[PDB]
Amino acid sequence: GASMRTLLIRYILWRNDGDPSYYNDDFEKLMLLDELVDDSDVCTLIKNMRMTLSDGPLLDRLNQPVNNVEDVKRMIAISAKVARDIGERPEIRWEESFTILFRMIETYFDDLMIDLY
Amino acid sequence: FQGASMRTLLIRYILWRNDGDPSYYNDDFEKLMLLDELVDDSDVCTLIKNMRMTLSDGPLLDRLNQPVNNVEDVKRMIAISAKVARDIGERPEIRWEESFTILFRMIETYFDDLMIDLYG
């Protein structure tokens, strides 16, 4: 694939629904990032992002800085575990969640692709 | 259709119409591919020019100044999104999140009707 954007959208949506038909081996290197976030912190991060039933991960509400590729990988891991824990529901506004994620991490796509691949 | 989200389905479908990657095919997409009949391949260039799209843009449907009043209009918007996504090429600079923001703001209220009309 040519797009980190397309990969991360697919990965996060798959972490949300856990549908084995939507598995791709492209996801295996992204799943390794789960180590960067404790399952115990996920509910804390959801409450810090003031999330309603209509919200996907809203990372800009964590007020945590993104200065390097390691911060990016933590934000992906947070997105994945939050996506996992909030449930597969039609009202989640994924487009708003991805807007915030890519505004935050876009500039580090080169560093990220090197670090993973 | 055994999924809960029209949003998730349409994001996956449009991204697959963009890259044509057979590993990202899903049979969920077959009913969406039938909507291609609502848009002639001949008009796609015209629609792209009318949406004033740059190399960094996905489909920007709100610039068509076309109405969305019923499920049939929603199906045409999906078809336009699919063929434009097909014709603009798989490029990393395309800002898919901006394109999906516009599509779902336009069609979201018709999601229940759409899921019934397509999948039962």
Short mmCIF file of C-alpha atoms in Angstrom, two decimals:
data_model
loop_
_atom_site.label_atom_id
_atom_site.label_comp_id
_atom_site.label_asym_id
_atom_site.label_seq_id
_atom_site.Cartn_x
_atom_site.Cartn_y
_atom_site.Cartn_z
CA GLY A 1 0.00 0.00 0.00
CA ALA A 2 1.07 3.67 -0.61
CA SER A 3 -0.98 5.32 2.27
CA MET A 4 -0.34 5.26 6.05
CA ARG A 5 -3.73 7.11 6.25
CA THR A 6 -5.64 4.25 4.52
CA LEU A 7 -3.77 1.62 6.62
CA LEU A 8 -4.51 3.38 9.98
CA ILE A 9 -8.23 3.94 9.07
CA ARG A 10 -8.55 0.22 8.19
CA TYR A 11 -6.59 -0.89 11.30
CA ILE A 12 -8.61 1.25 13.78
CA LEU A 13 -12.00 0.20 12.26
CA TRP A 14 -10.89 -3.47 12.54
CA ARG A 15 -9.87 -2.96 16.23
CA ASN A 16 -13.41 -1.57 16.72
CA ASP A 17 -15.46 -4.46 15.17
CA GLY A 18 -12.95 -7.40 15.54
CA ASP A 19 -14.47 -8.87 12.31
CA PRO A 20 -12.16 -11.71 11.13
CA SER A 21 -13.26 -11.07 7.46
CA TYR A 22 -11.61 -7.58 7.74
CA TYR A 23 -8.29 -8.92 9.14
CA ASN A 24 -5.18 -8.02 7.08
CA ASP A 25 -1.56 -9.08 7.88
CA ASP A 26 -0.64 -5.37 7.30
CA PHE A 27 -2.15 -4.99 10.88
CA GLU A 28 0.35 -7.33 12.68
CA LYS A 29 3.10 -4.63 13.07
CA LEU A 30 0.42 -2.10 14.31
CA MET A 31 -0.90 -4.67 16.91
CA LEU A 32 2.65 -4.79 18.50
CA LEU A 33 2.03 -1.15 19.64
CA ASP A 34 -0.67 -2.43 22.13
CA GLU A 35 2.27 -2.84 24.64
CA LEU A 36 2.54 1.03 24.85
CA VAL A 37 -0.89 1.31 26.68
CA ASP A 38 -2.16 -0.68 29.73
CA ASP A 39 -5.76 -2.02 29.42
CA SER A 40 -6.21 -0.42 32.93
CA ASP A 41 -5.68 3.16 31.57
CA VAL A 42 -8.23 2.88 28.67
CA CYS A 43 -11.38 3.88 30.69
CA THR A 44 -9.26 6.80 32.18
CA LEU A 45 -8.33 8.01 28.64
CA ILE A 46 -12.01 7.69 27.48
CA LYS A 47 -13.17 9.86 30.50
CA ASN A 48 -10.27 12.38 29.86
CA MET A 49 -11.53 12.68 26.20
CA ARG A 50 -15.08 13.41 27.59
CA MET A 51 -16.41 10.87 25.06
CA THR A 52 -20.18 10.37 24.47
CA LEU A 53 -21.76 7.37 22.67
CA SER A 54 -21.38 9.40 19.36
CA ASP A 55 -17.54 9.85 19.77
CA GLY A 56 -14.55 7.82 18.55
CA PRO A 57 -11.15 8.49 20.15
CA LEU A 58 -10.73 12.33 20.47
CA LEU A 59 -6.96 12.50 21.10
CA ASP A 60 -6.66 16.37 21.13
CA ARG A 61 -8.67 16.38 24.45
CA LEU A 62 -5.82 14.35 26.17
CA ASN A 63 -3.72 17.60 25.91
CA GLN A 64 -0.64 15.30 25.51
CA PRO A 65 2.17 16.49 23.19
CA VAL A 66 3.26 14.78 19.90
CA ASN A 67 6.94 15.67 19.21
CA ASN A 68 8.41 12.34 17.86
CA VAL A 69 7.48 8.94 16.29
CA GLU A 70 7.24 7.32 19.81
CA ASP A 71 4.40 9.79 20.73
CA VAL A 72 2.69 8.88 17.35
CA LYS A 73 2.88 5.10 18.11
CA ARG A 74 1.33 5.70 21.60
CA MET A 75 -1.52 7.73 19.95
CA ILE A 76 -2.17 4.82 17.50
CA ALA A 77 -2.14 2.32 20.44
CA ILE A 78 -4.58 4.58 22.40
CA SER A 79 -6.83 4.86 19.30
CA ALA A 80 -6.77 1.04 18.87
CA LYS A 81 -7.59 0.12 22.52
CA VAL A 82 -10.27 2.87 22.80
CA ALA A 83 -11.74 1.69 19.47
CA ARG A 84 -11.70 -1.88 20.95
CA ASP A 85 -13.36 -0.90 24.28
CA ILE A 86 -16.10 1.53 23.05
CA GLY A 87 -17.99 -1.22 21.10
CA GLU A 88 -19.17 -1.55 17.45
CA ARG A 89 -22.05 1.02 17.34
CA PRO A 90 -23.51 2.93 14.33
CA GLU A 91 -23.57 6.35 16.10
CA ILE A 92 -19.71 6.53 16.45
CA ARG A 93 -18.57 9.48 14.22
CA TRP A 94 -15.30 7.88 12.96
CA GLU A 95 -14.68 10.75 10.45
CA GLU A 96 -14.28 13.30 13.38
CA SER A 97 -11.91 10.86 15.20
CA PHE A 98 -9.67 10.36 12.09
CA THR A 99 -9.67 14.16 11.38
CA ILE A 100 -8.13 14.70 14.87
CA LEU A 101 -5.71 11.70 14.62
CA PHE A 102 -4.25 12.71 11.19
CA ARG A 103 -4.07 16.49 11.98
CA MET A 104 -1.96 15.37 15.04
CA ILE A 105 0.33 12.68 13.43
CA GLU A 106 0.35 13.40 9.59
CA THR A 107 3.84 15.06 9.49
CA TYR A 108 5.45 11.92 11.12
CA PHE A 109 4.15 9.42 8.45
CA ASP A 110 7.68 9.10 6.89
CA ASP A 111 9.35 8.41 10.32
CA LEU A 112 6.46 6.02 11.19
CA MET A 113 6.74 3.97 7.93
CA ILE A 114 10.55 3.61 8.50
CA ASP A 115 10.15 2.66 12.23
CA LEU A 116 7.48 -0.05 11.40
CA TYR A 117 8.88 -1.18 7.97
CA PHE B 1 -25.08 -7.56 6.34
CA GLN B 2 -24.01 -8.52 9.94
CA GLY B 3 -22.13 -5.21 10.69
CA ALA B 4 -23.60 -2.43 12.94
CA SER B 5 -22.11 0.69 11.14
CA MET B 6 -22.90 2.07 7.67
CA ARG B 7 -20.03 4.56 8.43
CA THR B 8 -17.44 1.73 8.85
CA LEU B 9 -18.76 -0.10 5.75
CA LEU B 10 -18.68 3.03 3.49
CA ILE B 11 -15.16 4.05 4.70
CA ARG B 12 -13.91 0.53 3.89
CA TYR B 13 -15.78 0.39 0.54
CA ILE B 14 -14.55 3.81 -0.74
CA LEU B 15 -10.89 3.11 0.32
CA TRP B 16 -11.07 -0.25 -1.53
CA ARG B 17 -12.48 1.49 -4.69
CA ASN B 18 -9.44 3.82 -4.44
CA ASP B 19 -6.60 1.18 -4.16
CA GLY B 20 -8.29 -1.87 -5.84
CA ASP B 21 -6.29 -4.12 -3.40
CA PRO B 22 -7.84 -7.62 -3.63
CA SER B 23 -6.72 -8.40 0.01
CA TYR B 24 -9.15 -5.61 1.14
CA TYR B 25 -12.14 -7.00 -0.87
CA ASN B 26 -15.21 -7.91 1.23
CA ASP B 27 -18.49 -9.43 -0.10
CA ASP B 28 -20.25 -6.66 1.98
CA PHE B 29 -19.14 -4.46 -1.02
CA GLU B 30 -21.13 -6.37 -3.73
CA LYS B 31 -24.43 -4.52 -2.96
CA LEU B 32 -22.52 -1.13 -2.98
CA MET B 33 -20.87 -1.97 -6.39
CA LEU B 34 -24.41 -2.26 -7.97
CA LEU B 35 -24.79 1.54 -7.33
CA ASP B 36 -22.08 2.17 -10.05
CA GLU B 37 -25.05 2.12 -12.57
CA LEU B 38 -26.22 5.53 -11.13
CA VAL B 39 -23.10 7.35 -12.60
CA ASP B 40 -21.66 7.13 -16.18
CA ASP B 41 -17.82 6.72 -16.30
CA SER B 42 -18.07 9.58 -18.89
CA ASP B 43 -19.24 12.17 -16.25
CA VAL B 44 -16.53 11.39 -13.61
CA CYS B 45 -13.95 13.91 -15.07
CA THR B 46 -16.75 16.58 -15.07
CA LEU B 47 -17.64 15.84 -11.39
CA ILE B 48 -13.91 16.03 -10.36
CA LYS B 49 -13.55 19.47 -12.14
CA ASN B 50 -16.88 20.71 -10.56
CA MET B 51 -15.52 19.71 -7.07
CA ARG B 52 -12.35 21.84 -7.84
CA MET B 53 -10.29 18.95 -6.43
CA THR B 54 -6.50 19.29 -5.88
CA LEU B 55 -4.07 16.33 -5.66
CA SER B 56 -4.56 16.44 -1.80
CA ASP B 57 -8.43 16.02 -2.04
CA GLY B 58 -10.77 13.02 -1.96
CA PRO B 59 -14.32 13.45 -3.29
CA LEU B 60 -15.75 16.82 -2.03
CA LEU B 61 -19.46 16.22 -2.67
CA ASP B 62 -20.78 19.49 -1.07
CA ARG B 63 -19.17 21.42 -4.02
CA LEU B 64 -21.53 19.59 -6.52
CA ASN B 65 -24.43 21.66 -5.01
CA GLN B 66 -26.62 18.57 -5.62
CA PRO B 67 -29.63 17.72 -3.43
CA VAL B 68 -29.81 14.91 -0.80
CA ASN B 69 -33.56 14.53 0.04
CA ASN B 70 -34.07 10.68 -0.14
CA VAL B 71 -32.18 7.32 -0.07
CA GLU B 72 -31.86 7.38 -3.94
CA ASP B 73 -29.81 10.66 -3.67
CA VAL B 74 -27.63 8.94 -0.95
CA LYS B 75 -26.96 5.98 -3.33
CA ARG B 76 -25.92 8.42 -6.15
CA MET B 77 -23.51 10.20 -3.68
CA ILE B 78 -21.96 6.79 -2.75
CA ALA B 79 -21.61 5.90 -6.46
CA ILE B 80 -19.96 9.32 -7.19
CA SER B 81 -17.60 8.81 -4.19
CA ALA B 82 -16.70 5.30 -5.46
CA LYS B 83 -15.97 6.25 -9.12
CA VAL B 84 -14.09 9.46 -8.13
CA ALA B 85 -12.09 7.43 -5.56
CA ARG B 86 -11.37 4.94 -8.43
CA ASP B 87 -10.29 7.62 -10.96
CA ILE B 88 -8.12 9.91 -8.71
CA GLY B 89 -5.46 7.19 -8.03
CA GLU B 90 -4.00 5.66 -4.80
CA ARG B 91 -1.83 8.53 -3.45
CA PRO B 92 -0.74 9.14 0.19
CA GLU B 93 -1.50 12.93 0.05
CA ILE B 94 -5.31 12.30 -0.34
CA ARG B 95 -6.98 13.65 2.85
CA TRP B 96 -9.67 10.91 3.16
CA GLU B 97 -10.85 12.17 6.59
CA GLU B 98 -12.01 15.56 5.04
CA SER B 99 -13.83 13.65 2.22
CA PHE B 100 -15.65 11.32 4.72
CA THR B 101 -16.57 14.33 6.97
CA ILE B 102 -18.43 15.90 3.98
CA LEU B 103 -20.03 12.58 2.82
CA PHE B 104 -21.40 11.58 6.29
CA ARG B 105 -22.59 15.14 7.23
CA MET B 106 -24.60 14.95 3.92
CA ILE B 107 -26.04 11.35 4.17
CA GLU B 108 -25.87 10.32 7.92
CA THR B 109 -29.65 10.86 8.68
CA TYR B 110 -30.53 8.30 5.87
CA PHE B 111 -28.27 5.47 7.25
CA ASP B 112 -31.16 3.35 8.65
CA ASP B 113 -33.19 3.67 5.36
CA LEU B 114 -29.98 2.92 3.35
CA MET B 115 -29.09 -0.26 5.35
CA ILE B 116 -32.71 -1.57 4.86
CA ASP B 117 -32.80 -0.68 1.09
CA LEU B 118 -29.40 -2.47 0.47
CA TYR B 119 -29.28 -5.46 2.89
CA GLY B 120 -32.94 -6.13 4.03
#
